[PDB]
Nucleic acid binder design. Structure first.
Ligand SMILES: [Mg+2]
Ligand SMILES: [Mg+2]
Ligand SMILES: [Mg+2]
Ligand SMILES: [Mg+2]
Ligand SMILES: [Mg+2]
Ligand SMILES: [Mg+2]
Lengths: 128, 125, 236, 51, 109, 225, 63
RNA sequence: CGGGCCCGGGGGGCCACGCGCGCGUCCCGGGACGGCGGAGCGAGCGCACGGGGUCGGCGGCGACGUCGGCUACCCACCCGAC
RNA sequence: CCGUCGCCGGCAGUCGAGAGUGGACGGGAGCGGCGGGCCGGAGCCCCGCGGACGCUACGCCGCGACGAGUAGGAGGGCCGCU
């Protein structure tokens, strides 16, 4: 009953865990987002066995499923009704997303316009 | 010239929307709304555009004259087709194929005009 | 139309060579030199609607989709399931006793009838012995024992295709919301056609089971593994 | 015209890939299949004479 | 009636000495202790049947609380029985030294 | 106009079919000829040996002339004169066979690489199975699988090699255009030897792998490609 | 691993003009088409000289 | 179980041998062999070890309890880890 | 499968009518295969008026080889802050 994508390939992720920064567990001052370890004795940088894995380009996802939502679509961010019609001809491979700033009165009109224009909206329940 | 104007508006344009890993374009006579040299409703000597009508019945086919390329008040001639869905498609098909008026935007004008009529059908829950 | 005139040695190699087959076909004398509808006319609904209407069938579509999918390349193999060649394991000849390994009738000892068209094995337990009726069963979920009954001079009815045993469907004509619970059609009932084909086949299999001694009690027991036996050491 | 990658098949296992490279391989093959069945029928005549 | 599967032990994963590869398990089937004795088992379906807290669905019955991880015996490992087995999801290490069923499905007898 | 342009189109597709069936018959008869020529060679070595045993004499065969080298030792810690010789044989990676032509220039540089290569004298079955299973070409510096004879004939065709059977005869009977045929082959990529190496680090005649095992290299090729 | 060196793999060479001049970029499209679809090696010389820097492209006097 | 397209002349197997005229060479008027001559294309069915997978094959289960989904949620075990 | 490098790779032919390993003619002389009464010869598409996608050319498509790295160099950043 939902709008279906055009095709739906099997999406294969080469890795599903995030890359945490080395020693982000040991400290609150170290946040988890990644910094490349530059240090002369670092056993993460030197890639010992049993350590934290470093991100590199080999983990890159298959570029016909890249940026694909887990239900076949790709995401486009919208703010008002008149930039929703750029998805009129991208119907079965891109889905609209009302941005966070758009008020409750105005995202009524985006939802029913996209319903009569066959565009899937990812968050059509946001001030209800 | 269409190429010389394209080298200006390729990356710098008010109609150009660049958000997450995809680019769109919002100029009026643009089928597909894609930022492309073939589909651009401003730079070519002859363009095709289709839009919904004044009220929600029909499609407005707008084409571009030969003559007044620097006269924007009179450069476009607008036609409202309000047939059934099958013969409004053979109408747009004849305006492109029989005149040889820009016959690469032909099927893109049919995909848009079919999808613009399905928007006008009464929605069922 | 003649036969192939070229016997096979192995698959994809004929026995007779290229010029040898020029002369078996007599191609030296058998050689040769040189050499809708889409629109109908349909009559008038007049008067002064003058002229018949030329109307085509195959009209043009009312709605193209937004995007299409490009078509595939070509494959040169890859037949449908109805055209696969059927293989039967060399242990299994008509009349052997099978040990059903998988269904509701796990462990039963049934007697193998004809093999059907879709590769499935038409099997009967004698229903009077172990309550397995005429069913299909799959080849690779079945152990062939070495015990044989001569089912030559036994007439299997010819309306016993794959379509005879295929399950039946009804749901769901004209019902759209789930409030009315329906306790019908999930009960299977035996038809009279199903019930007398069993009697037509048990009538002539049973005199050959009562022929050899104590095959009956063998065909009434179920198979099992105990603390001794290991199946790589058993003899089937 | 797009020439994509042709999957390399083994002519030592796939017969019509061998015949596309060596058409004579069919003629060797029918000569060695017939020669091995002619010698095999000739050795079960030696066995069916000295018995 | 009757057991109808052959009983095997989950020994460990396919491993070196200081590396283990959890995608391939190592099984010891009771009764076979030589590599020439193991050709019977080389395509056989195999299951790890265990119980958990919540109910799950049962194909052919009401919801039990048994759960199954299915696998296949792929090849032999070593010179004394010891097949290795490929499961659909990798076996939990809780299972090491417990029962794995070996099933007699797809048959070649 | 329009009917005459079909008939000129159907006759140029007819000449190409006639040219195609003439070229298929050429490579058919070249391979029937080479089959005779290999029986010429193989039976002659037996007859020359038998006529010497009758007279109480010895027949020393021809010193062989086709070798097949295989790099057995990897790329870590290799001395520079040895490292330069291995990249003149195109052995840049471990298990990377190629054919070489034996003479005094090539034998004295195979002695420089004794502990890195294993080599010997291949037979006709070994040169068939390497070309068919693992023979790729160097076609404008790409590595192209030899899936059709037009790939061989477009490069080596000016030397007379127009099918894969001619290429095998040019390698095995080390002909006048051996150099261009061997260099056409991208050097081979063999797997690890199935069943083990029996002590890689030492010479074949003292229990290992290095150097010249002479016709036992054929026993190595079977379990490696 | 292979025994090769990688320091001269990427060959340093112009393959487009570095300028953003749109009349220059527009007759690069003309000569890149003419260098592809023609056997002429004149067009392959003129194409790469359009790529060049000003100091690799000096003034030619009338004399 | 040599070579000479198994030289050639005479008296069961194999052949990727198969139009006629017209010239050529060779052999015993007859042949055989030609890469030789100025003149236009066979058609239709199938089958496939043939430029990378398909089925024109199938079964079971289902709203107050199950189905799938989840990670900087928690816990457990094996292995690795200063 | 991801990237890089190489192919000075391909695509402006969106050419459902585009089509050429040369083509036209235009008389001089002729064949076959067509329409015999031994005399003689163009079909310029269409019963269907129709036939997916593409080419942000700073784009898109292909093919092959390749991928350790401190100090250091260089590029890309639809990474982020004012
Ligand atoms: Mg250090
Ligand atoms: Mg239990
Ligand atoms: Mg070392
Ligand atoms: Mg490096
Ligand atoms: Mg690196
Ligand atoms: Mg650094």
């Amino acid at each position: 009953a939902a709008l279906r994508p055009l095709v739906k390939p099997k999406i294969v992720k080469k890795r599903t865990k995030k890359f945490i920064r080395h020693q982000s567990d040991r400290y609150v001052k170290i946040k988890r987002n990644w910094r490349k370890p530059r240090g002369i004795d670092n056993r993460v940088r030197r890639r010992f066995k049993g350590q934290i894995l470093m991100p590199n380009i080999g983990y890159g996802s298959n570029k016909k499923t890249k940026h694909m939502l887990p239900s076949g679509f790709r995401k486009f961010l919208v703010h008002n009704v008149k930039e929703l019609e750029v998805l009129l001809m991208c119907n079965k491979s891109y889905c609209a997303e009302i941005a966070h700033n758009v008020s409750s009165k105005n995202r009524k009109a985006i939802v029913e316009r996209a319903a009569q224009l066959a565009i899937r909206v990812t968050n059509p329940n946001a001030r209800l | 010239s269409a190429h010389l104007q394209w080298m200006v508006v390729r990356n710098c344009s008010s109609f150009l929307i660049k958000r997450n890993k995809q680019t769109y374009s919002t100029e009026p006579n643009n089928l597909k709304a894609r930022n492309s040299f073939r589909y651009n409703g401003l730079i070519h000597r002859k363009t095709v555009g289709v839009e919904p009508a004044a009220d929600g019945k029909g499609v407005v086919v707008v084409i571009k004259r030969r003559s007044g390329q620097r006269k924007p008040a009179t450069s476009y001639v607008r036609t409202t087709i309000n047939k059934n869905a099958r013969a409004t498609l053979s109408s747009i098909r004849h305006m492109i194929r029989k005149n040889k008026y820009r016959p690469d935007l032909r099927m893109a004008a049919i995909r848009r005009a079919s999808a613009i009529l399905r928007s006008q059908k009464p929605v069922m829950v | 139309p003649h036969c192939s005139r070229n016997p096979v040695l192995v698959r994809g190699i004929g026995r007779y060579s290229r010029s040898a087959m020029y002369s078996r076909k007599a191609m030296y004398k058998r050689k040769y030199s040189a050499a809708v509808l889409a629109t109908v006319t349909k009559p008038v609904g007049g008067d002064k609607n003058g002229g018949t209407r030329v109307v085509k069938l195959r009209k043009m579509p009312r709605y193209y989709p937004t995007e299409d999918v490009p078509r595939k390349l070509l494959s040169h193999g890859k037949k449908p399931f109805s055209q696969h060649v059927r293989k039967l394991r060399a242990s299994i000849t008509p009349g052997t006793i099978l040990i059903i390994l998988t269904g509701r009738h796990r462990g039963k000892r049934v007697v193998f009838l004809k093999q059907l068209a879709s590769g499935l094995l038409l099997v009967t337990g004698p229903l009077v012995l172990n309550r397995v009726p005429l069913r299909r069963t799959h080849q690779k979920f079945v152990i062939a024992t070495s015990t044989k009954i001569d089912i030559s001079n036994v007439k299997i009815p010819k309306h016993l295709t794959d379509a005879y045993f295929k399950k039946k469907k009804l749901r769901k004509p004209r019902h759209q919301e789930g409030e009315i619970f329906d306790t019908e059609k999930e009960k299977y009932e035996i038809t009279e056609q199903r019930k007398i084909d069993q009697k037509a086949v048990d009538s002539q299999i049973l005199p050959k089971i009562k022929a050899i001694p104590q095959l009956q009690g063998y065909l009434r027991s179920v198979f099992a593994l105990t603390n001794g036996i290991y199946p790589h050491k058993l003899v089937f | 015209k797009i020439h994509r990658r042709v999957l390399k098949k083994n002519p030592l296992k796939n017969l019509r890939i061998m015949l596309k490279l060596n058409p004579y391989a069919k003629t060797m093959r029918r000569n060695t299949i017939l020669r091995q069945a002619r010698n095999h029928k000739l050795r079960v005549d030696k066995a069916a004479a000295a018995a | 009636s009757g057991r109808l599967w052959s009983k095997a032990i989950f020994a460990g994963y396919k491993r070196g000495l200081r590396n283990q590869r959890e995608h391939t398990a190592l099984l010891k089937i009771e009764g076979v202790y030589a590599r020439d004795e193991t050709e019977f088992y080389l395509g056989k379906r195999c299951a790890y049947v265990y119980k958990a807290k919540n109910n799950t669905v049962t194909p052919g019955g009401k919801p039990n609380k048994t759960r199954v991880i299915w696998g296949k015996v792929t090849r032999a490992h070593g010179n004394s029985g010891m097949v290795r087995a490929k499961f659909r999801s990798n076996l939990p290490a809780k299972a090491i030294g417990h029962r794995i069923r070996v099933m007699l499905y797809p048959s070649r007898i | 106009n329009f009917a005459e342009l079909k008939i000129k189109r159907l006759r140029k597709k007819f000449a190409q079919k006639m040219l195609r069936k003439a070229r298929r018959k050429l490579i058919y008869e070249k391979a029937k000829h080479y089959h005779k020529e290999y029986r010429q060679m193989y039976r002659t070595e037996i007859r020359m040996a038998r006529m010497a045993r009758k007279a109480g004499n010895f027949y020393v065969p021809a010193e062989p002339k086709l070798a097949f080298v295989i790099r057995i030792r990897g790329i870590n810690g290799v001395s520079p004169k040895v490292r330069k010789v291995l990249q003149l044989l195109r052995l840049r990676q471990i298990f990377n066979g190629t054919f070489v032509k034996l003479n005094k220039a090539s034998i004295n540089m195979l002695r420089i690489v004794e502990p890195y290569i294993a080599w010997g004298y291949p037979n006709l079955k070994s040169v068939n199975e390497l070309i068919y299973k693992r023979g790729y070409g160097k076609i404008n510096k790409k590595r192209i699988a030899l899936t059709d004879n037009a790939l061989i004939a477009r490069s080596l065709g000016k030397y007379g090699i127009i099918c894969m059977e001619d290429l095998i005869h040019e390698i095995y009977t080390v002909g006048k255009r051996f150099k261009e045929a061997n260099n056409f082959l991208w050097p081979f990529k063999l797997s690890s030897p199935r069943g083990g190496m029996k002590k890689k680090t030492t010479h074949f005649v003292e229990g290992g792998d290095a150097g010249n095992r002479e016709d036992q290299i054929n026993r190595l090729i079977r379990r490696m490609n | 691993g292979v025994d090769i060196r990688h320091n001269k793999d990427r060959k340093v060479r112009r393959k487009e003009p570095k300028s953003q001049d749109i009349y220059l970029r527009l007759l690069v499209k003309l000569y890149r088409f003419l260098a592809r679809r023609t056997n002429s090696t004149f067009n392959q010389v003129v194409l790469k000289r359009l790529f060049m820097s000003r100091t690799n492209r000096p003034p030619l006097s009338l004399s």
